[PDB]
Amino acid sequence: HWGYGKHNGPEHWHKDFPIAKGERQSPVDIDTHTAKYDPSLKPLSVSYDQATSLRILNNGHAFNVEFDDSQDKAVLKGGPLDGTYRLIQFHFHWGSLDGQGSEHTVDKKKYAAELHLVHWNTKYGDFGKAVQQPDGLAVLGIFLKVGSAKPGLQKVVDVLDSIKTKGKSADFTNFDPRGLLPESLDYWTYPGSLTTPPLLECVTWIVLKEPISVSSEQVLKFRKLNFNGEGEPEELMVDNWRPAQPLKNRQIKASFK
Numbered sequence: 098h099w100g101y102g103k104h105n106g107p108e109h110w111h112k113d114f115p116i117a118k119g120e121r122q123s124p125v126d127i128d129t130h131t132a133k134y135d136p137s138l139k140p141l142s143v144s145y146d147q148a149t150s151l152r153i154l155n156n157g158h159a160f161n162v163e164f165d166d167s168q169d170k171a172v173l174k175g176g177p178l179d180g181t182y183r184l185i186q187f188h189f190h191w192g193s194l195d196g197q198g199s200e201h202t203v204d205k206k207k208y209a210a211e212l213h214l215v216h217w218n219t220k221y222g223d224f225g226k227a228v229q230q231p232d233g234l235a236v237l238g239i240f241l242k243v244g245s246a247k248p249g250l251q252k253v254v255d256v257l258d259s260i261k262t263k264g265k266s267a268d269f270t271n272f273d274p275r276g277l278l279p280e281s282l283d284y285w286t287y288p289g290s291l292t293t294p295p296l297l298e299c300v301t302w303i304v305l306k307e308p309i310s311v312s313s314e315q316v317l318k319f320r321k322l323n324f325n326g327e328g329e330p331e332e333l334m335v336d337n338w339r340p341a342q343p344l345k346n347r348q349i350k351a352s353f354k
């Protein structure tokens with residue numbers, strides 16, 4: 098099964114998932130000079146005041162903070178999107194070192210990590226149907242740089258000891274994802290894919306320009322997680338990022354001048 102190692106990592110995924118070489122794969126490098134301001138875009142509406150977090154899970158690839166998506170409670174609207182997208186989970190990608198870890202890059206710069214808030218289009222009724230559609234998902238991507246601590250991340254960091262290994266989960270109610278957002282909602286957007294198998298080409302990506310700052314100690318605790326299950330030899334969960342993929346026939350649009 099797929100992973101991030103030399104024998105099962107990104108260069109191998111195309112054998113089981115041929116769409117890995119498709120026309121709208123993610124992530125990509127965002128060339129800031131080539132992206133074009135689009136005055137047709139609207140501000141992003143991020144409405145997370147009623148979000149209901151439930152659980153945090155180590156799935157062997159990353160950890161997911163899961164939300165109750167049985168009602169419009171935490172939704173993304175506006176920007177490039179038509180209609181309403183419900184938050185289902187967020188997770189991160191990160192490196193073994195502070196100079197790598199993001200999936201998207203900005204003028205080839207790698208950030209220490211990247212947060213993905215995953216939302217599905219409510220017109221398709223749930224997530225499994227949404228992933229079969231070209232406009233099924235919207236992923237809000239936020240870069241993490243190492244600097245000052247992000248207070249709203251600390252509850253996540255402090256629960257990681259309890260989900261060290263693959264398949265472990267813990268209650269994670271009453272978490273407010275508003276505390277993971279930067280001040281500005283300026284963004285880039287393009288049509289892409291999931292960055293993990295099955296790599297489905299269902300995503301409108303919305304990548305914020307402003308990174309959030311996290312402390313070195315916060316990201317160090319991400320790097321103490323394990324890819325392996327309990328009782329198995331320890332494999333640190335680091336470098337769980339897919340590199341940039343060919344842009345092919347796409348244009349990245351900017352919401353800002």
Ligand SMILES: NS(=O)(=O)N=C1NCCCN1
Pocket residue numbers: 213215236290291292293294295
């Ligand atoms: N990293 S990612 O693009 O968000 N890929 C995902 N794969 C499975 C479903 C949700 N997300």
Ligand SMILES: [Zn+2]
Pocket residue numbers: 188189190213292
């Ligand atoms: Zn992701």
